[PDB]
Amino acid sequence: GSPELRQEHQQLAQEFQQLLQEIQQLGRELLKGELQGIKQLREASEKARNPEKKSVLQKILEDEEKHIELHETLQQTGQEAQQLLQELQQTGQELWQLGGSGGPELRQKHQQLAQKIQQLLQKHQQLGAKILEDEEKHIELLETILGGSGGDELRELLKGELQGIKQYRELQQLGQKAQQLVQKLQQTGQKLWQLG
Ligand code: HEM
């Protein structure tokens, strides 16, 4: 009903804010792991003597350099998402305050902001998914080329990679929840002034 629907919309948007925060923090923990993983890869790579193991390591390392970069895009789409969320909150409150006395430019802004934030989430999701498939390949390669020697650190590189995958899977799950919240904010939002 109309007050209850207003509150649901409001509560979805609070839930969404908290989730965006969780996504950003997880993204920073992921970049910390990437940097620490690069150090461990270089350590394995220096000690490697077999040419093929050396090469496999250096090609993982290239991927990881790319993932550092892609973390810049992850971070930014998330940041921009939080910016648009701020603007959703602000335009939202102004809509309730002013109604249709706040002219049509206000209602269009809020709709347009909703449209754009869903695209940023899709962009963010696609970037995360691409990193994750890489890390799944890294594990296969590491399990394949490395042995039980001290210098290989099969355990240390694998452990780090495995912790990373667990976190990137979580990241994608939080993103899918976010996209689902946005859908529901649209579904409730469209109803809010239908018996206003
Ligand atoms: C992530 C946060 C939010 C999203 C994605 C979002 C999205 C939407 C969407 C898609 C609509 C339907 C727009 C249309 O009629 O074409 C809507 C309506 C509305 N939203 Fe939000 N909203 C959010 C947060 C808020 C907040 C915090 C308020 C605060 C009061 C608010 C107030 C409104 C109002 C009053 C309407 C009905 C009038 C209108 O259609 O413009 N919204 N919202």
Numbering used by the authors: 1 to 196
Question: What did the study's authors say about this model?
Answer:
Hydrophobic core packing, rotameric states of heme-ligating histidines, and second shell histidine-threonine hydrogen bonds are similar to the cytochrome b subunit of cytochromes bc1 and b6f. Even the orientation of the maquette heme relative to the superhelical bundle axis is conspicuously similar, suggesting that the particular conformation of heme in the natural proteins is not precisely controlled for any functional purpose, but rather follows directly from structural constraints demanded by this protein fold. In the nearby metal binding site, Glu/His ligation of Cd(II) in the RC maquette accurately reproduces the geometry of the binuclear Mn(II) cluster shown to be photochemically active in modified bacterioferritin. At neutral pH, Zn(II) and Cd(II) suppress Tyr oxidation. These metals may electrostatically inhibit proton transfer from Tyr to protonatable residues in the metal cluster site. While the introduction of a hydrogen bond from Tyr to a His residue appears to have little impact on the lifetime or yield of charge separation by itself, the addition of Asp31 adjacent to the His71-Tyr168 hydrogen bond raises the yield from 2 ± 1% to 11.5 ± 0.7% and shortens the lifetime of charge separation from 40 ± 20 ms to 3 ± 1 ms at pH 9.5. Without a crystal structure of the L31D/L71H RC maquette mutant, however, we cannot confirm that the Asp31-His71 hydrogen bond forms; it remains possible that Asp31 raises the quantum yield of electron transfer by altering the dynamics and hydration of Tyr168 rather than by acting directly as a proton acceptor for His71. Bacterioferritin-like ferroxidase activity demonstrates that the diiron site is redox active. Light-induced electron transfer is clear as near-stoichiometric Fe(II) prolongs the lifetime of charge separation from 2.0 ms to 250 ms at pH 7.5 in RC maquette variant L71H (orange and Supplementary Figs. 8b and 10a).
Here, we report the rational design, X-ray crystal structure, and electron transfer activity of a multi-cofactor protein that incorporates essential elements of photosynthetic reaction centers. To this end, we have designed a photosynthetic reaction center protein maquette (the RC maquette) and solved its X-ray crystal structure in multiple states of assembly. To begin reverse-engineering photosynthetic reaction centers, we use first principles of protein folding to construct a single-chain framework for positioning DPA cofactors that consists of an extended four α-helix bundle coiled-coil. The RC maquette uses histidine (His) residues in the hydrophobic core to coordinate the central metals of tetrapyrroles for site-specific cofactor binding.
